[PDB]
């Protein structure tokens, strides 16, 4: 299929999916090579072709460090890229529903990865299943990662900051300018991201140049708010000159110090990325989202305290355990091949790996709310409270502080609670319900008969589908077919969310209360005390 | 730096400020000189120019009288123009954030000084601080003042008045032109003036030709519906008779009156200004603001009544002292060298010296209200009463009742009660928090580490300047980091207040009460009385 | 004075008004010539002139009967024309302010007299006093009356009806178009009209052509809903041929009538009115408005009931005695020169002249009504009730019902009770507030020192003058400077109205409560017994 954008033409391929057919159009190009010169700078717009872009596979993903953790283990694998590595690597793939549609509602995925990693052509981001299931048009773009992507000299137009940020942007841009090509409604664009995607969604949600790019966003796990969101200003600046000195590249000039980083090799790059921070936490954003006075034009707590941004529904959700993904990168005790029941004085140092630099007290606070319990000495308490430590902390928290305020200036927000462990999941029964675990069920994946997913999870996939699609199409992410109990706003008040799982799917109020009053408001003031 | 307006180019120049830069435009014409035959007429546009205009300093101050009753004295002199006085004199300052914003809010100040004085170059109308610490775009304007700027001839297109009001209107009109090319938001533009330049601003929500040339509006110890600010389609005609006059300049045909006038040495003008009004006061405004038609289209009492105004958010305030500057320009026993202790016989003195023309009764029951007191003979006492008798009736109560009326037709509103005296004022202790010294405080100056401000009295500034832009951007004073308790809105029921110091910082309600009853309630019913 | 309208220019005179000046254009031309071909037909509209209008005298009057009562008498002659009668007679009036105003509001006056005489000319319709006193530019313009004005042949465009209604439309039009050349705001015109001119003004607002036209109307003694104001598609045709029968004009082809019609001497046409309706009434509308498809696309009750009209302020108002101006035209025991007492028998009488076509029953129970009272035998009585009979079935009632449905559907209305006599009023005491005589007031005419008016008239009709300029201006007719009680919105659950006199000004509700649940509702119900 042969289609005309305003750059020139795009061909595409013919996919068959569930006895009928998607067309994939795999890696078009939607800026120029952020190569030589255009390394660091926000990405320049592409100059007309004259002849066909052959978009019929996926094309390289993004310069990032692999996860050498665990060779050959599927858990940590299927998040690795699965193409090339190459600074080449802005470009985009479509999927389009069987017959070409007239105007379809879109959906735009923005991977996640704590920033430093992540690729659009993971099997489970594959959106052809949501293209034949609910007729959508689906886009997923590829943008910068780590240093490439954020690396901060405040103002400097060398080095802006957030340029995987505007590499989203103008992909954004683009679907605005061709969707309409593909049988697509621009009018109707759906950001959906997870973790580090969620962040950037919300991030949209306050730019005000991303403004009209999309209409309703979808967030999962993860929103700007959280503690590994965003770098201060201050932080950015330090973190660039500590990689200049690594790479023996400090001068005193500053626009001289962007081009000998501009200069060194990819690789030489992403070696000392994971150094600049001081002390490691498996939690570690090197190179983030900063404000930067063009993408963000003040701090995002402020504009979201303040109503400043999109006003629009919300769909927003959590994992039943977002926390224990991290815990075998590091936490004393813990690891993926043993049920890792840990003692106080593991637990204790699991502490300090995951809060560095914080006061005795601060770490004193944590354990004593997440040690008060019925104790019977169950041998895994301990293990089973530093990974809801993590994850509270983490996500959760911040993903319900960031509900509450957008709820409050008027539009209707969703809130789930996904509490169902992938039959087929590579990690152990303790790490539970995962990080990560649901976008599988989003894309569809469970619907695919000759996987060895169950028929409770058909179901559940296929419900979850249907929600996240009636979101998108009308603002309403009912499923109002085979479904008993409807999903309700959540409102500031009342603060209700929906459950998603395979047997019971219950309406719940106020989440995790207790612990995110802890962490919103109390912790909060320890940390103010040392220092 | 080089910047091209619809007239033409400018340059600029290269300010640092705290570490950082900020560009400067010193002293861009926004307008055609008004002199000789243009003298008193409607400022005339400017028409394109081939080169390059150097601005990089500030233009001259416009033509007014100088302030010698304290000849050395920064006190006094720190207000005196600090430019060549001349007729040539409509310019325009502007200041950038460090890199070009994309676009920035704008904040336009109007200078106060009663409309006989005052220029935009003093030292406390800096605006680089604002740009440079919340990123705006800071503009002011010069504007005729006195007779050159307020002659009335009541239609006559030759002298019809209000011409320093058209002047700061041209130079908003300058800014929706322009400020765009500078990286400014003309979409978002908020107008902040004092005393007089808050009556200014106040004039401008009510002027239709201003309507569409500014966003919100701040109003800093000033309003138009107080005694000094707005001056009957009589008086005007009268003062401009008694001028001709004392100028030789009396005549048969009206027209004939400013061909003489519009010949005289502009000294000879500012010589007979202060001799056209029979009755001297220290708040005299011989040639303010009138009914012409043109810029007001109706009295302006009505105009506020009837809800026809600009509909926006408003913040205004005033403060504690907002009497005491001017009872050292008349008032017997008063002196800046002394404490100033009174007698109950001087104070009536002061009163006759304040309201000249008033009934033996308006001055017994001012005196009644301010006279009783705790007295166990508080030397005091009287020197107390005789500043709060003038500040209640000439900026505070006013100023109240502005913001009942405007926020009887639906808009937020926010007041505050500015209650903190500069450590470096060079006035007496007694003269408390002083008519014009919040200024300093809005425009950062106490943000400068190298001047002998306080630490307490940079956190003061700091705060107030977030507040400021806060409002300028988003419509809401709120200082979101730092603040415990957020500024409520004024809502004509409650009327609440937030108060502005170095210690407390409380929420209050209904300010001078009593007093505001007395002097828009029951002394107005005593005017009336006595013819 | 030139002024250069969409269709050549005109010249205009300077009129001395209060020691100040006014710019009159009367007798501007708007539409063709309705003469020849054109009698009958909707106003055409004009060509280019390539010269000068020399607009400095009233126009012809329009053709219609003359009131010979009483000749010589002021009282009736007052509201004979004043020019030459012309069917050459489509011409309008302009007023304008002092200096030229910028955009100024614009009153638009329709003048009264029974859709049957008439003209913009009359003393008491001068807006040069409006224009003066309160800046605003007045507008009128004459509409052909009587047959040449809404003879009907229902569908018939050769005769369709509503040609007066037209000619108004019109010059509403021409407003729209050429009022910015004079300093005229198109987009703030309030309709003003008394009697048939109020029930023109209704008329408009359900008149979708007439939507755009204006922006609010004022109402004074007079509305659509008024037994005399429509006439229905029956009745039209029915006295159209009459007409053609009492000038040999009946045919077979109907186009054939118009055509002899069309031929006629304009004299003969207005001595044949009077005789086309059977039975004479005092408040007879020979010829009037019809529903004719085109100026009004339904039945006018209906659309008034379910909200199809204007949605805009409204202010409306009678006066105390409206009735009485009518019993000196045929009803039995009265005469402008004795004091009329009055017998129940010729009351009985009196009755069957303004009630011609009743049951004995109507007329039993509007003598029951209006004759139980406070007997003692006052002589007035009957002549008291006769009058209040003819005006509250007439005026007051029907205006009161129009502002309850119209006020149903939204907007604010404001009514008024106009009580007090002219000092010159040259009918006797007994008649009271005649119907017609507030005009005097509205216009301003005791605002003129040299006429004889009382001191108390002229702060009244000061008062008038202004609360009709804020309506028009603001759209809220309160006078905020001399007045105690401001004017309260009539709402149609407590129907509260504002008195306009010398002595009090109070605010009361239900005007006339009793006698018009009697005229809406009762009696209505006896008129459908009896056939």
Request: glycine share 8%.
């Given at each position: 299929?042969?289609?005309?954008?305003?750059?020139?033409?795009?061909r595409?391929?013919?996919?068959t999916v569930?006895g009928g057919?998607?067309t994939?159009?795999?890696?078009?190009?939607?800026?120029?090579p952020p190569?030589?010169?255009?390394r660091?700078?926000?990405?320049?717009s592409?100059?007309?072709?004259?002849?066909?872009?052959?978009?019929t596979?996926?094309?390289?993903?993004?310069?990032?460090?692999?996860?050498?953790?665990?060779?050959?283990?599927?858990?940590?694998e299927m998040?690795?890229?699965?193409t090339?590595?190459?600074?080449?690597?802005?470009?985009?793939?479509?999927?389009?529903?069987?017959?070409?549609?007239?105007?379809?509602?879109?959906?735009i995925?923005?991977?996640?990865?704590g920033?430093?990693?992540?690729?659009?052509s993971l099997?489970?981001?594959?959106?052809?299943?949501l293209?034949?299931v609910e007729?959508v048009?689906?886009?997923?773009?590829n943008?910068?990662?780590?240093?490439?992507?954020?690396?901060?000299?405040?103002?400097?137009?060398?080095?802006?900051?957030?340029?995987?940020?505007?590499?989203?942007?103008?992909a954004?841009?683009w679907?605005?300018?061709?969707?309409?090509?593909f049988?697509?409604?621009?009018?109707?664009?759906?950001?959906?991201?997870?973790s580090?995607?969620a962040?950037?969604?919300?991030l949209?949600?306050?730019s005000?140049?991303?403004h009209?790019l999309?209409?309703?966003?979808?967030?999962?796990?993860?929103?700007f708010?959280?503690?590994?969101?965003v770098t201060?200003?201050y932080?950015?600046?330090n973190?660039?000159?500590?990689?200049?000195?690594?790479?023996?590249c400090?001068?005193?000039?500053?626009?001289?110090?962007?081009?000998?980083?501009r200069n060194?090799?990819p690789?030489?790059?992403?070696?000392?990325?994971?150094?600049?921070?001081?002390?490691?936490?498996?939690?570690?954003?090197?190179?983030?989202?900063?404000?930067?006075?063009?993408?963000?034009?003040?701090?995002?707590?402020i504009?979201?305290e303040l109503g400043?941004?999109?006003?629009?529904?919300?769909?927003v959700?959590?994992?039943?355990?977002?926390?224990?993904?991290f815990?075998?990168?590091g936490?004393?005790?813990?690891?993926?091949?043993?049920?890792?029941?840990?003692?106080?004085?593991?637990?204790q140092?699991?502490?300090?790996?995951?809060?560095?630099?914080?006061?005795?007290?601060?770490?004193?606070?944590?354990?004593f709310?997440?040690?008060?319990?019925?104790?019977?000495?169950?041998?895994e308490?301990?293990?089973?409270?530093?990974?809801?430590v993590?994850?509270?902390?983490?996500?959760?928290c911040?993903?319900?502080?960031?509900?509450?305020?957008?709820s409050?200036?008027?539009?209707?927000?969703?809130?789930?609670?996904?509490?169902?462990?992938?039959?087929?999941?590579p990690?152990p029964?303790?790490?539970?319900?995962?990080?990560?675990?649901?976008?599988?069920f989003?894309?569809?994946?469970?619907?695919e008969?000759?996987?060895?997913?169950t028929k409770?999870?058909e179901?559940?996939?296929?419900?979850?589908v249907?929600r996240?699609?009636?979101?998108?199409?009308?603002?309403?992410?009912?499923?109002?077919?085979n479904n008993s109990?409807?999903?309700?706003?959540?409102?500031?008040?009342?603060q209700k969310?929906?459950?998603?799982?395979?047997?019971?799917?219950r309406?719940?109020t106020?989440?995790?209360?207790?612990?995110?009053?802890?962490?919103?408001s109390?912790?909060?003031?320890?940390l103010e005390?040392?220092?």
């Amino acid at each position: 299929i042969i289609i005309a954008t305003k750059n020139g033409k795009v061909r595409g391929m013919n996919l068959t999916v569930f006895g009928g057919t998607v067309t994939a159009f795999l890696g078009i190009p939607y800026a120029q090579p952020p190569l030589g010169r255009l390394r660091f700078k926000k990405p320049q717009s592409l100059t007309k072709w004259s002849d066909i872009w052959n978009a019929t596979k996926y094309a390289n993903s993004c310069c990032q460090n692999i996860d050498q953790s665990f060779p050959g283990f599927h858990g940590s694998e299927m998040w690795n890229p699965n193409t090339d590595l190459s600074e080449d690597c802005l470009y985009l793939n479509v999927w389009i529903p069987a017959p070409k549609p007239k105007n379809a509602t879109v959906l735009i995925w923005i991977y996640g990865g704590g920033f430093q990693t992540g690729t659009s052509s993971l099997h489970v981001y594959d959106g052809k299943f949501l293209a034949r299931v609910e007729r959508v048009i689906v886009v997923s773009m590829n943008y910068r990662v780590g240093a490439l992507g954020f690396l901060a000299l405040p103002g400097n137009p060398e080095a802006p900051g957030n340029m995987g940020l505007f590499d989203q942007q103008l992909a954004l841009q683009w679907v605005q300018k061709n969707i309409a090509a593909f049988g697509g409604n621009p009018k109707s664009v759906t950001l959906f991201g997870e973790s580090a995607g969620a962040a950037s969604v919300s991030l949209h949600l306050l730019s005000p140049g991303s403004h009209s790019l999309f209409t309703r966003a979808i967030l999962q796990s993860g929103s700007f708010n959280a503690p590994w969101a965003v770098t201060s200003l201050y932080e950015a600046r330090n973190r660039t000159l500590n990689l200049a000195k690594l790479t023996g590249c400090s001068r005193e000039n500053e626009t001289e110090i962007i081009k000998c980083l501009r200069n060194k090799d990819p690789q030489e790059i992403l070696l000392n990325e994971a150094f600049v921070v001081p002390y490691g936490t498996p939690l570690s954003v090197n190179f983030g989202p900063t404000v930067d006075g063009d993408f963000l034009t003040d701090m995002p707590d402020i504009l979201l305290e303040l109503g400043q941004f999109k006003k629009t529904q919300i769909l927003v959700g959590v994992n039943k355990d977002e926390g224990t993904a991290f815990l075998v990168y590091g936490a004393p005790g813990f690891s993926k091949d043993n049920n890792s029941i840990i003692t106080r004085k593991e637990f204790q140092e699991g502490l300090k790996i995951f809060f560095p630099g914080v006061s005795e007290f601060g770490k004193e606070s944590i354990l004593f709310h997440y040690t008060d319990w019925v104790d019977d000495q169950r041998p895994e308490n301990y293990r089973e409270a530093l990974g809801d430590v993590v994850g509270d902390y983490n996500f959760i928290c911040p993903a319900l502080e960031f509900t509450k305020k957008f709820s409050e200036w008027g539009n209707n927000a969703f809130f789930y609670y996904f509490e169902h462990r992938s039959s087929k999941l590579p990690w152990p029964e303790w790490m539970g319900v995962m990080h990560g675990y649901e976008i599988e069920f989003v894309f569809g994946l469970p619907l695919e008969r000759r996987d060895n997913y169950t028929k409770a999870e058909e179901i559940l996939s296929r419900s979850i589908v249907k929600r996240w699609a009636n979101f998108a199409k009308y603002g309403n992410p009912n499923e109002t077919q085979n479904n008993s109990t409807s999903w309700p706003v959540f409102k500031s008040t009342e603060q209700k969310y929906l459950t998603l799982n395979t047997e019971s799917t219950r309406i719940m109020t106020k989440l995790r209360a207790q612990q995110c009053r802890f962490w919103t408001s109390f912790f909060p003031k320890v940390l103010e005390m040392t220092g």
